[PDB]
Ligand binder design. Sequence first.
Ligand SMILES: [Zn+2]
Ligand SMILES: [Zn+2]
Lengths: 115, 115, 173, 171, 123, 123
Amino acid sequence: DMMDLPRSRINAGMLAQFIDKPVCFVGRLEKIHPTGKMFILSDGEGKNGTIELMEPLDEEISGIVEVVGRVTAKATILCTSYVQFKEDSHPFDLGLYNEAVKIIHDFPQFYPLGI
Amino acid sequence: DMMDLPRSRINAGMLAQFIDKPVCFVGRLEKIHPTGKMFILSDGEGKNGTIELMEPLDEEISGIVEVVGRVTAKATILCTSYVQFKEDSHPFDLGLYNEAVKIIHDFPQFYPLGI
Amino acid sequence: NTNWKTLYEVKSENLGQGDKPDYFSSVATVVYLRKENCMYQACPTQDCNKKVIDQQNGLYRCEKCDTEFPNFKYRMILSVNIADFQENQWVTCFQESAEAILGQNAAYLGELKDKNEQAFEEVFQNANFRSFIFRVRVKVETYIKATVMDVKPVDYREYGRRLVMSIRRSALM
Amino acid sequence: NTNWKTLYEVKSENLGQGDKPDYFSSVATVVYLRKENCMYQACPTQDCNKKVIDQQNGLYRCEKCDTEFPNFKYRMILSVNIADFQENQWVTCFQESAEAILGQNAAYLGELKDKNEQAFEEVFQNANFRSFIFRVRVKVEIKATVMDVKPVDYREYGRRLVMSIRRSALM
Amino acid sequence: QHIVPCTISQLLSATLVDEVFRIGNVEISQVTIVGIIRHAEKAPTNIVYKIDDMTAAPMDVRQWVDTDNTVVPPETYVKVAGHLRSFQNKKSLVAFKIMPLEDMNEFTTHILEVINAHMVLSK
Amino acid sequence: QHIVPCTISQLLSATLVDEVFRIGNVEISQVTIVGIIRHAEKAPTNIVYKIDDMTAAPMDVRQWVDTDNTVVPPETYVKVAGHLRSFQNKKSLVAFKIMPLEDMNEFTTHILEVINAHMVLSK
Ligand SMILES: [Zn+2]
Ligand SMILES: [Zn+2]
């Protein structure tokens, strides 16, 4: 299991530099497969991520969602866990989140994510 | 041929994503192997890229250098041609350069590559 | 626009060292609140806030409007420590600010000062380690003093941006 | 500090209407010059610079100093048209600046005006499509007045550039 | 005194030279972190939350409780002010406070503050 | 009037429908481009330099030179004021000016000017 290792925050643009790596993808839910085993998320710059679930969905995902999982050889995320951001007070600014994510990567010495 | 193809402007930490692509690498002349056939240029983030010549240097190289070439499998750059920036008047800001390189790639749509 | 600063900067740059005061803005977290002097005996007069003298004679003397009264007036004068990721700053906060940083009014506060020595310390315990945007005047003093002109609840989306630009700016060098 | 503004911004924000002037700065390229008036005859007493009248008798009078003189002093007052990636604007450059843009003191430069009519056309060509940092005043009667012209600094212009693109994604 | 924004990963890296704490050339006492609550135990003397910020495995954060019990449920983002405590060489977090997250933008901003923080802080 | 800094790739691409030129939806008149000189031929009616900015194949720039002969040497960096001249679906550049760069920083700044300008113009 991955919940005990570092999990890099990324957007669609990175998916291919993270093949086989445990990650943390945050984006807005756009479409969920019928067999609720494959939904997709649009990151903060609009690029799209394809989240695959080893198992079918109980409740209804929707809105901003954070997924943790491992990047596939086909540049997708086999999702191990996901949480839905709380927005009842304020709408989560996804484009800002995105600028942070790029900032994290431009300065890994200030936001470590290895070992 | 190299020179009639669109060449992407990259920094050392991009080599990996331009495996086998035609690029343009600007940087500073650090080490310059004794066979004269290979040399090292440091980009504007301090990181290094290795440049390989098909024929050992014909001259003394120094300062800022622009190398055009293809990205090898060992993530180095087989150089098709190179240029030395004219500085005698105003020192070249290699760092401002890099900042531009990142933007060229953050904003493809406003600085396209290829027709 | 706003004069955004960091504690280290206000110190470092020497804001308030000279002639007239200096005004600056920073985001900070309250790291400590002194519960002692936080409250004083206030002239009961309209808009007057001088400290009334306790004439043990059941009466209260405001030296400013040279009058005496029975009634009382409570007014906050909260000494606080605000700190950021680099520094801290002892700032004094009158009625206005302090009521924001604490949650209640000088009336409601001072009273509970007698009643429960605890339910009181409760408000002070709670209010600590919270963040706000502070507008802060700063001028020298002899025997540098800091006065909290305003207090707003931090806006994160906007501090996010500001921070972002700051990082990018730090990069250019 | 400085009030950097694009020309479309200077126009847009309507600088110039207010009761007092406005000042901005920009980096623009001289896109055109109007040699049409560029020079004028001026009181040759140092510091007055009125358009002396030619008494046609080989004497000129300055209705300010209240004096007739025999001699001269030519002065520049160039109408320049500058542009950026999105707009252009007509300004007017007096002595100091104009010499900065053409490279020749109006003094010397003026005599040539008539000597070689094509040699004059020399500068008004080599000067065109050159770029500068412009300090500009603006009132209404809007009216741009070039307070100052410095050669563009690309490094600094560069940084300013990087910061605005980024500022731009924070939408 | 001053209070430093961090990530767990950086806390784990800090060392205790001369009974003090450093993340590189930075001395750290009080620190904040934002993260999600993966586990919460009442214990009998204080609460013990396993808190995750995705940058390393979840850290233990315990705060003194009273008994003479409001536990933040799991799956909830919370900022945490408090101080780092090295013991048996393992690292835990001792919690001055634990404000659950109201506006999730606060969490984004934290990242930004952690990064901004250690940049200035490293000269 | 207004002059638009572009990249050759943006030109080769431009569409000319509606008798006008539009890269993206931006219509371009005059333009500037920085690039390095790969070839230069002194012809008798005007010079013809092949200029590279690496975004695409080096495009042709023509400057009308008089003769009633000092060419910019190859492998030197120049900025170029001019305007897109489409001819038989074969884009070219007609050169008002052609100045070599003394300070290579200008080269960097252009890249920025380009991207900056098109972002602003586009909407
Ligand atoms: Zn009174
Ligand atoms: Zn006169």
